[PDB]
Curated annotation (Swiss-Prot), chain B:
It comes from the Eukaryota. DNA-dependent RNA polymerases catalyze the transcription of DNA into RNA using the four ribonucleoside triphosphates as substrates. Component of RNA polymerase I (Pol I) which synthesizes ribosomal RNA precursors. Besides, RNA polymerase I has intrinsic RNA cleavage activity. Proposed to contribute to the polymerase catalytic activity and form the polymerase active center together with the two largest subunits. Subunit RPA12 contributes a catalytic zinc ribbon that is required for RNA cleavage by Pol I. Involved in transcriptional termination. It comes from Saccharomyces cerevisiae (strain ATCC 204508 / S288c) (Baker's yeast). The lineage of its organism: Eukaryota, Fungi, Dikarya, Ascomycota, Saccharomycotina. This is DNA-directed RNA polymerase I subunit RPA12. The keyword Zinc applies. Belongs to the archaeal RpoM/eukaryotic RPA12/RPB9/RPC11 RNA polymerase family. The chain holds residues 2 to 66 of 125 of the full protein.
Swiss-Prot record, chain C:
There is a cross-link at K59 (Glycyl lysine isopeptide (Lys-Gly) (interchain with G-Cter in ubiquitin)). One of its GO terms (molecular function) is DNA-directed RNA polymerase activity. It comes from Saccharomyces cerevisiae (strain ATCC 204508 / S288c). GO terms for biological process: nucleolar large rRNA transcription by RNA polymerase I; ribosome biogenesis; RNA-templated transcription; termination of RNA polymerase I transcription; termination of RNA polymerase III transcription; transcription by RNA polymerase I; transcription by RNA polymerase II; transcription by RNA polymerase III. Component of the RNA polymerase I (Pol I), RNA polymerase II (Pol II) and RNA polymerase III (Pol III) complexes. Component of the RNA polymerase I (Pol I) complex consisting of 14 subunits: RPA135, RPA190, RPC40, RPA14, RPB5, RPO26, RPA43, RPB8, RPA12, RPB10, RPC19, RPC10, RPA49 and RPA34. The complex is composed of a horseshoe-shaped core containing ten subunits (RPA135, RPA190, RPB5, RPO26, RPB8, RPB10, RPC10, RPA12, RPC19 and RPC40) where RPA135 and RPA190 form the DNA-binding cleft. Zn(2+) binds at C7, C10, C45, C46. This is DNA-directed RNA polymerases I, II, and III subunit RPABC5. It is found in: Nucleus, Nucleolus. Belongs to the archaeal Rpo10/eukaryotic RPB10 RNA polymerase subunit family. It comes from the Eukaryota. Present with 5300 molecules/cell in log phase SD medium. InterPro entries: RNA_pol_su_RPB10, RNA_pol_suN_Zn-BS, RPABC5/Rpb10. Gene3D superfamilies: Homeodomain-like.
Curated annotation (Swiss-Prot), chain D:
It comes from the Eukaryota. The chain holds residues 1217 to 1600 of 1664 of the full protein. It is found in: Nucleus, Nucleolus. Component of the RNA polymerase I (Pol I) complex consisting of 14 subunits: RPA135, RPA190, RPC40, RPA14, RPB5, RPO26, RPA43, RPB8, RPA12, RPB10, RPC19, RPC10, RPA49 and RPA34. The complex is composed of a horseshoe-shaped core containing ten subunits (RPA135, RPA190, RPB5, RPO26, RPB8, RPB10, RPC10, RPA12, RPC19 and RPC40) where RPA135 and RPA190 form the DNA-binding cleft. Outside of the core, RPA14 and RPA43 form the stalk that mediates interactions with transcription initiation factors and newly synthesized RNA. Transmembrane segments: none annotated. Present with 2840 molecules/cell in log phase SD medium. It comes from Saccharomyces cerevisiae (strain ATCC 204508 / S288c) (Baker's yeast). Disulfide bonds: none annotated. DNA-dependent RNA polymerases catalyze the transcription of DNA into RNA using the four ribonucleoside triphosphates as substrates. Component of RNA polymerase I (Pol I) which synthesizes ribosomal RNA precursors. Besides, RNA polymerase I has intrinsic RNA cleavage activity. RPA190 and RPA135 both contribute to the polymerase catalytic activity and together form the Pol I active center. In addition, subunit RPA12 contributes a catalytic zinc ribbon that is required for RNA cleavage by Pol I. This is DNA-directed RNA polymerase I subunit RPA190. The gene is RPA190.
Swiss-Prot record, chain H:
It is found in: Nucleus, Nucleolus. The lineage of its organism: Eukaryota, Fungi, Dikarya, Ascomycota, Saccharomycotina. Component of the RNA polymerase I (Pol I) complex consisting of 14 subunits: RPA135, RPA190, RPC40, RPA14, RPB5, RPO26, RPA43, RPB8, RPA12, RPB10, RPC19, RPC10, RPA49 and RPA34. The complex is composed of a horseshoe-shaped core containing ten subunits (RPA135, RPA190, RPB5, RPO26, RPB8, RPB10, RPC10, RPA12, RPC19 and RPC40) where RPA135 and RPA190 form the DNA-binding cleft. Outside of the core, RPA14 and RPA43 form the stalk that mediates interactions with transcription initiation factors and newly synthesized RNA. DNA-dependent RNA polymerases catalyze the transcription of DNA into RNA using the four ribonucleoside triphosphates as substrates. Component of RNA polymerase I (Pol I) which synthesizes ribosomal RNA precursors. Besides, RNA polymerase I has intrinsic RNA cleavage activity. The heterodimer formed by RPA34 and RPA49 stimulates transcript elongation by Pol I. Subunit RPA49 can bind both single-stranded and double-stranded DNA. The chain holds residues 11 to 115 of 415 of the full protein. It comes from Saccharomyces cerevisiae (strain ATCC 204508 / S288c) (Baker's yeast). It comes from the Eukaryota. The modification Phosphoserine is found at S24. This is DNA-directed RNA polymerase I subunit RPA49. Belongs to the eukaryotic RPA49/POLR1E RNA polymerase subunit family.
Length: 778, 65, 69, 274, 192, 98, 57, 100
RNA sequence: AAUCGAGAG
DNA sequence: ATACGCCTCTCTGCTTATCG
DNA sequence: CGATAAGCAGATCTCTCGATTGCGTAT
């Protein structure tokens, strides 16, 4: 047997004739699967696509003319269907355009964006529909809206791209750009937080809190913060238009669903009636509300107060009743991951969050670390593209209403039923949504009325520079903590935590300023780009023994709280919850039960002494980080996430599997490293800073960018003339097809102190070898 | 109804008013518009104890280990 | 890209042996060491030059700006 | 240590030194047991460091509190802290209840937006605002229960968080600007005694245990206050030098002396900044 | 870089003595009776209290670090230079470590005998909220390898968990050097 | 108001009580027509679950519901039936390999 | 640089006659000082030279 | 052993709140569509109640009397209703549609 | 000229 | 096609206030 | 007058590259 093979004949045959079915390197495509899948999820998939859901939740914005209790004629402009075309050209009958032409022309590779407006009048009296082109929207290569989507390597070569061209990037002004993946708080999970900044937020502020980052079905997010004041009252927080507002928690608790106060007492305090801490804090809260707001005795009155309080900041229409605008803000701010028609579930989740806040302030649960990988997810970049597009079409829909308002206030008459008037106004506004998206790609700046729940503004897209193929493939696996942490002094954010085992590469990190903040995924790490079928999971859970969350009336860490994506499914004892988690894992790994997708991340937190807040947490959404691992019972592949991993024992190799201690084992230890960190020979014999230096330096080598260089017009390109394959190489050198892109040369190296001209770090090159073309490049 | 220092109506489940906070012999439910008497609510007692993480000291460390 | 004319270290002409190496690998069922020895490459400096050549010229040649594709 | 210390010394000249310290030489005729006794006598003890638990029994039968303060056993705290039943009872009678009532009345203001025992209880009631009972275990030093009656307009208070805050912030026996006095292992022969604070005049009295002529401190501003410019210059040199001693970096004393004489050129502690 | 057969024998014999050092350190920090089993409920409870409480965790880390450093010192003294097949002045690694041309006895020791305990700031490796220091190790494991004590050397290579801990320490060093060079210069500017 | 499709049951059935009141909860895979027992060759875990579950029993009218009081009338014991599975003990002689 | 973070600038193009030569007759095309290793501790480069020689043979 | 199991609606269980007591003058009226609605009233109260649609399709509840001497245990079926009790004087209070 | 991004010691 | 005005996570030291 | 609780200010090596830089409007 031979440990490795050069595969010379196979490689040369494949060079001669590119495959006509599929590329021979499947792993080289799963590397860019996050970016491609994120851009794909906004046009295809269930529910019509992310852009369609985004327009649906943008809804209608109305205005009144004022012409003669009767506010005038109502105009409600909106969009209900958005489509992107694969890029065409008129050079009549159009012809397909491929990115080679965009590269050669030094221009962008963009497809036309079409929105069909709804010019509704008088709530359905008559509707004027007209599709409007809104500029050429840039699209990423190898996506379902790109013309290379299904081509074989043979067809890719015929269309001048590459033998194994990968997408995941855009082309703007003849320059390739990539939306970096950012790592943000885990969605739809309330995590206890201790922050001295919360105390700084004013006076009577503790440092405790409960922060949940709810995500809408169209992948937009809303952060709700549940502060605790030292007196005893709990404060709700949210941000709407780059400003921040505060609300008593009891206001929202009563506004959500028609409920009593004994129900709030039972929801926050379960069977723990004898718990003086909880009872006294809750009495303080209830009496503080009944003192401050004695004229809000029912849900309708509370909603009307909220509506009166929120008029000019929410751009509520003159027709909107106070009750309905209060319902609008309640459905548009509070726990948006449950969406509308989920007031009861939002009520349960707020009660759970309040009890968790009281546990955090009583020191019965430890604070959840927000910078630990256990409590994080990835913002894919295609999702950010969809969110920015939704914000831009919202701005457009508001700008056309601004135009008609300016017409109204300039003294000109109108007719909302007139297609001529609709045409006249639609040509006085800005419809280069595509040009604004191109601006975002070409600068990185995020021009926004809402910060999209994100912290930074600039620094969102980097050029996918192609010095070298390691550099190029590294662009598509780098994840950033955010530019806020770039200028800081808390070194603890850069620490290599054990919570990233198998998700973040321990080695691949740039040295210097971006050390610790710029990370790379382990090469077998996968970021999900779709929601797993979870409709049947609550049904299976009730059969397993989960008592339903509607008629059980339990609360506290004394019981396990079963949740699914932030929705309290039911309550169960801790032992039975452990059994439920084990049985769910078994049924999920064995592919018999149709209601348990293998991507399901059953993150179970056992009871402990002042540890993390317990309960059984189930996740199946987008943006999760998942890695394969061998489930030991029935010996099949399993999928785990960072949240689930910090509690499960996973033997690194099968030799040290212990009795009744391990339920998992890695497929191989080498799948906790990046591609670059796997390509280092005998990495486990060097000092780790030298492995980090190698990851940094292998992206800077004058290797081979690609083979279609006669069809590119890049600003600067470095090409090694004659590369060679390594004699000593990892088994994954072939799996990613790195032989297609040679990076160096096998050299005869004498470790000798002979010359005198190489002492500190210099090295000597043979003159004759140099004259024979050793290490030549252009 | 009565839980420590808290009393809830048995009809609408609304928190009442504390007895010694309003006009005499009549504590009124703000939802049910019912009338409750100051009787049978003799002592709303709550017994609390300190956190046991509240007083870090040299002697407290020696208490356990 | 294309086979080097000479070995880098010693200078032995190894540019006329790449096609023969492929022939001996394909037609004959020879392992790489046997094929390199039968080509006359004894020093490992000369053996590496052929054993590790990639031959990217073939992949470069598929992008021909002078013939219709 | 290190560069933060250099910032404190030469960059900031902070009179508010982060860790003030005094090195107290001991006379050669003072044994280790007396050294520890002096350390515990000097070191401060807060009320929180002697209390095991506190029980607050609110009753609405007008609203009253029964605050019971459970102490560590006498054979424990009178040994570890040099604190007696009498000293504890005096502290609770004088400072604790006054601070507690001050906190309570401030809280309400924010909300509006054996005949010896009998006579002691009567005196405590008369002097204090709204206390109605008081009994201290004068035979075991084990507990202290005192009632506290508020009005009927008063809203509910936790009465445990304020009690904890008062119990922490109330001292028992503290010398100003001094927290702890630890007796480390003697090094290079001489036996030292380092406190976690600077109060030169407090140990000026303790001629018996402390060689006052050799009390060398860490805070440059304090020694400038009490001893003068030149002692400040000496301690500047010493503090700017012993930072380099742990890092084993040899810097000549001419540089440090020139920097010290530039920093004390006006007779004060001038920093190197604007 | 190699040792003798007798040198390797001494190295492995002294390293076998490092099996119970972590368990003894835990039993003595937790004040439990020595020779108590590693799966004792009281030991696990006290280790959990120590995990929650930062100062107690630091005490445990420092005590166990001292014990494993003693084991490392024993290994190095027993195996260098008396356990090395090629000896000074022929042994060039040892030669230039002794001579001051480059390197030190610590580097030679890590290449030939033992990398030893990996120290993060001034403590052992970070622990999760479940008491696990890595997915492989069971919660509250009183094993020196679990705490970052790597018995491997750069000649025979280090295991995956040891590789992970060593990467932690190396990243910490690379961060600390940047912080230090950033902070050095303002002092000199203001003084000058 | 009455939501569409809802039709009020008018004639109810008797309840022979003057005996212990029990509550038992079954899953959706248990045929109710027919502490770890076997039902239809299946494995079911059974355990037990300031009250909220009141008892509504028809009065002597067979047309409405009332709250018994012999202050509600609470069930003497609440049971639960749970679906389970057998977790296979790992055979170490295979996976444990040098 | 090697694949072990052993970066260094080329200090001279040493003529081949002045290069050291082996009993086999070959003259190395790269010379790296032995002092780059004791502090960097890149034993992977040593074992890679070993394995590369064995593989090319 | 199990002798008779009832399917026709006989009894039901509700979740009003902790320690709920109701006067003897009040009654309840059921509705079946399986989704259920319950309704009751008195002078200043309303016993409205619905059920969780997503849960009733999975969990089923059984009631029954037991015989200490015999074996013919009794069995029954009873759905669960999650009820929200409402007042009457605090139901229909509103304000202006928009405050100027 | 700024701003952003990538680097080197 | 085009020419005027519009677009959220550190630190010491100086200085004023303000209330019994 | 004065002693904090509070508010406000100005700080926190050298070198090489590339890419973009502003939108609405009234006539
Ligand atoms: Zn009532
Ligand atoms: Zn040769």
């Amino acid at each position: 047997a031979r440990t490795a093979d050069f595969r010379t004949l196979e490689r040369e045959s494949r060079f001669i004739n590119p495959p006509k079915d599929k590329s021979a390197f499947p792993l080289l495509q799963e590397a860019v699967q996050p970016h491609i899948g994120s851009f794909n999820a906004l046009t295809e998939g269930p529910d019509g696509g992310l852009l369609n859901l985004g327009v649906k939740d943008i809804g209608e914005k109305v205005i009144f003319d004022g012409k003669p209790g009767y506010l005038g004629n109502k105009l409600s402009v909106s969009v209900e269907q958005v489509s992107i075309a694969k890029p065409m050209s008129n050079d009549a009958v159009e012809r397909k355009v491929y990115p080679s032409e965009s590269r050669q022309r030094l221009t962008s590779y963009r497809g036309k964006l079409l929105l069909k407006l709804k010019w509704s009048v008088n709530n359905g009296e008559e509707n004027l529909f007209e599709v409007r082109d809104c500029g050429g929207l840039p699209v990423m290569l190898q996506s379902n809206r790109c013309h290379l989507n299904k081509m074989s390597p043979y067809e890719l070569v015929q269309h001048k791209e590459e033998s194994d061209e990968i997408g995941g990037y855009f082309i703007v002004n003849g320059i390739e750009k990539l939306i970096r993946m950012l790592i943000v708080q885990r969605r739809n999970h309330p995590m206890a937080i201790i922050r001295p900044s919360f105390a700084n937020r004013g006076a009577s502020y503790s440092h405790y809190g409960i922060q949940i980052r709810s995500v809408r079905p169209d992948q937009t997010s809303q952060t709700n913060v549940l502060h605790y004041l030292n007196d005893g009252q709990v404060t709700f927080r949210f941000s709407w238009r780059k400003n921040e507002y505060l609300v008593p928690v009891v206001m929202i608790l009563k506004a959500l669903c028609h409920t009593s106060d004994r129900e709030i007492f039972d929801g926050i305090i379960g069977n723990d009636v004898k718990d003086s801490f909880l009872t006294d804090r809750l009495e303080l809260l209830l009496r503080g509300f009944k003192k401050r707001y004695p004229h809000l005795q029912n849900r309708t009155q509370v909603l009307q107060y909220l509506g009166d309080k929120f008029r000019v900041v929410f751009q509520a229409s003159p027709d909107q009743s106070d009750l309905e605008v209060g319902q609008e803000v309640l459905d548009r701010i509070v726990l948006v991951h449950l969406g509308k028609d989920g007031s009861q579930d939002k009520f349960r989740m707020l009660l759970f969050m309040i009890r968790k806040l009281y546990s955090l302030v009583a020191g019965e649960c430890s604070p959840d670390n927000p910078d630990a990988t256990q409590h994080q997810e990835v913002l894919l970049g295609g999702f950010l593209y969809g969110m920015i597009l939704k914000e831009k079409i919202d701005e457009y829909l508001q700008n056309i209403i601004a135009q008609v308002r300016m017409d109204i206030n300039r003294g000109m008459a109108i007719n909302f039923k007139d297609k001529r008037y609709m045409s006249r106004v639609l040509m006085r506004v800005n419809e280069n949504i595509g040009s604004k998206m191109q601006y975002f790609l070409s600068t990185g700046n995020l021009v926004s009325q809402s910060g999209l729940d994100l912290q930074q503004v600039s620094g969102y897209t980097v050029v996918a520079e192609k010095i070298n193929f390691y550099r190029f493939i590294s662009h598509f696996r780098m994840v950033h903590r955010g530019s806020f942490f770039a200028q800081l002094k808390t070194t603890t954010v850069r620490k290599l935590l054990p919570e990233s085992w198998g998700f973040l590469c321990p080695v691949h990190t740039p040295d210097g300023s971006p050390c610790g903040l710029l990370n790379h995924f382990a090469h077998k790490c996968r970021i999900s780009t779709q929601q797993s079928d979870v409709s049947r999971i609550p049904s299976i859970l009730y059969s397993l023994g989960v008592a339903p969350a509607s008629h059980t009336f339990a609360a506290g860490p004394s019981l396990c709280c079963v949740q699914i994506d932030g929705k309290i499914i039911g309550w169960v004892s801790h032992e039975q919850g452990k059994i439920i988690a084990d049985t769910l894992r078994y049924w999920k790994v064995e592919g018999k039960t149709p209601g348990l997708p293998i991507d399901l991340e059953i993150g179970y937190v056992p009871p402990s002494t002042r540890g993390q807040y317990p309960g059984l947490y189930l996740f199946g959404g987008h943006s999760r980080m998942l890695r394969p691992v061998r489930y030991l019972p029935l010996d099949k592949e399993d999928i785990v996430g960072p949240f689930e991993q910090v509690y499960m024992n996973i033997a690194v190799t099968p030799q040290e599997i212990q009795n009744n201690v391990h339920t998992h084992v890695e497929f191989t230890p080498t799948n906790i490293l990046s591609i670059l960190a796997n390509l280092t020979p005998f990495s486990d014999f060097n000092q780790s800073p030298r492995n980090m230096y190698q990851c940094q330096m292998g992206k800077q080598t004058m290797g081979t960018p690609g083979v279609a260089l006669c069809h590119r017009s890049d600003n600067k390109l470095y090409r090694l003339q004659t590369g060679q394959t390594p004699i000593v190489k990892a088994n994954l050198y072939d799996d990613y097809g790195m032989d297609n892109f040679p990076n160096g040369f096998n050299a005869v190296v004498a470790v000798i102190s002979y010359t005198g001209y190489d002492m500190d770090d210099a090295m000597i090159i043979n003159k004759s070898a140099d004259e024979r073309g050793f290490g030549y490049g252009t | 109804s009565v839980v420590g220092s808290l009393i809830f109506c048995l009809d609408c489940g609304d928190l009442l008013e504390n007895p010694n906070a309003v006009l005499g012999s009549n504590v009124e439910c703000s939802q049910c518009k019912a009338i409750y008497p100051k009787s049978q609510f003799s002592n709303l007692k709550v017994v609390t104890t300190t956190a046991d993480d509240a007083f870090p000291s040299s002697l407290r460390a020696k208490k356990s280990v | 890209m294309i086979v080097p004319v000479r070995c880098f270290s010693c200078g032995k002409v190894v540019g006329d042996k790449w096609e023969s190496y492929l022939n001996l690998l394909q037609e004959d069922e020879l392992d790489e060491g046997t094929a390199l020895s039968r080509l006359g490459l004894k020093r490992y400096c000369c053996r590496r030059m052929i054993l590790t050549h990639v031959d990217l010229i073939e992949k470069f040649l598929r992008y021909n700006p002078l013939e219709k594709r | 240590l290190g560069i933060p210390r250099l910032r404190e010394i030469v960059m900031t000249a902070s009179a508010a030194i982060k860790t003030p310290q005094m090195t107290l030489p001991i006379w050669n005729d003072v044994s280790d047991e007396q050294a520890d006794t002096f350390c515990k006598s000097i070191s401060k003890v807060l009320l929180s460091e002697v209390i095991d638990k506190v029980i607050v029994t609110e009753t609405t039968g007008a609203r009253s509190y029964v605050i019971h303060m459970r102490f560590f056993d006498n054979n424990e705290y009178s040994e570890e802290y040099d604190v007696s039943k009498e000293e504890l009872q005096n502290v609770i009678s004088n400072q604790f209840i006054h601070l507690l009532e001050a906190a309570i009345v401030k809280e309400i203001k924010k909300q509006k937006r054996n005949k010896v025992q009998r006579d002691r209880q009567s005196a405590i009631i008369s002097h204090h605002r709204f206390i109605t009972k008081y009994n201290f275990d004068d035979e075991s030093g084990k507990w202290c229960e005192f009632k506290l009656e508020l009005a009927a307009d008063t809203e509910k208070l936790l009465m445990v968080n304020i009690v904890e805050e008062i119990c922490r912030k109330s001292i028992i026996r503290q010398i100003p600007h001094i927290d702890r006095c630890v007796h480390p292992e003697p090094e290079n022969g001489k036996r030292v005694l380092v406190t976690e604070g600077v109060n030169f005049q407090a140990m000026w009295d303790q001629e018996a245990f402390i060689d006052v002529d050799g009390i060398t401190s860490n805070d440059v501003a304090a020694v400038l206050k009490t001893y003068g410019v030149e002692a400040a210059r000496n301690t500047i040199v010493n503090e700017i030098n012993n930072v380099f001693s742990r890092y084993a970096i040899s810097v000549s004393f001419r540089h440090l002396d020139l920097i010290a004489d530039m920093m004390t050129r006006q007779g004060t502690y001038l920093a190197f900044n604007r | 870089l190699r040792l003798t057969a007798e040198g390797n024998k001494w190295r492995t014999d002294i390293l076998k003595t490092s099996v119970d050092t972590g368990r003894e350190a835990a039993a003595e920090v937790t004040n439990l009776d020595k020779d108590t089993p590693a799966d004792d409920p009281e030991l696990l409870k006290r280790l959990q209290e120590i995990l929650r409480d930062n100062n107690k965790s630091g005490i445990l880390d420092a005590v166990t670090s001292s014990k494993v450093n003693a084991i490392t010192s024993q290994v190095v003294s027993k195996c260098v230079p008396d356990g090395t097949m090629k000896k000074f002045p022929c042994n060039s690694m040892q030669a230039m470590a002794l001579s001051g041309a480059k390197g030190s006895n610590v580097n030679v020791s890590q290449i030939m005998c033992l990398l030893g305990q990996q120290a993060l700031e001034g403590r052992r490796v970070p622990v999760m909220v479940s008491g696990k220091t890595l997915p492989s190790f069971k919660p509250y494991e009183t094993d020196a390898m679990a705490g970052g004590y790597v018995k491997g050397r750069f000649y025979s290579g280090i295991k995956p968990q040891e590789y992970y801990f060593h990467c932690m320490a190396g990243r910490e060093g690379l961060i600390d050097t940047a912080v230090k060079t950033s902070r050095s210069g303002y002092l000199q500017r203001c003084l000058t | 108001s009455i939501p569409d499709g809802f039709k009020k049951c008018k004639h109810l059935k008797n309840f022979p009580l003057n005996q212990q009141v029990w509550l038992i909860k079954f899953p959706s895979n248990v045929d109710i027509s027919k502490t770890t027992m076997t039902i239809d060759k299946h494995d079911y875990k059974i355990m037990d679950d300031l009250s909220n579950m009141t008892l509504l029993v028809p009065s002597e009218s067979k047309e409405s519901l009332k709250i018994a009081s012999t202050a509600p009338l609470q069930f003497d014991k609440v049971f639960s039936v749970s679906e389970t599975a057998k977790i296979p003990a790992i055979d170490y002689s295979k996976v444990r390999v040098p | 640089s090697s694949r072990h973070g052993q970066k260094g600038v080329c200090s001279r193009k040493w003529p081949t006659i002045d290069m050291p030569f082996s009993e086999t007759g070959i003259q190395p095309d790269i010379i790296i000082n032995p002092h780059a290793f004791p502090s960097r501790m890149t034993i992977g480069m040593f074992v890679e030279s070993l394995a590369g020689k064995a593989g090319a043979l | 052993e199990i002798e008779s199991v009832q399917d026709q609606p006989s009894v039901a269980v509700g979740s009003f709140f902790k320690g709920f007591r109701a006067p003897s003058d009040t009654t309840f009226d059921l509705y079946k569509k399986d989704e259920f609605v319950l309704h009751g009233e008195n002078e200043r109260l309303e016993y409205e109640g619905y059920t969780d649609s997503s849960s009733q399709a999975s969990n089923q509840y059984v009631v029954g009397l037991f015989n200490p001497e015999k074996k013919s245990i009794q069995l029954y079926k009873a759905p669960v209703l999650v009820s929200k009790v409402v007042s009457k004087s605090s139901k229909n209070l509103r304000g202006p549609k928009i405050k100027s």
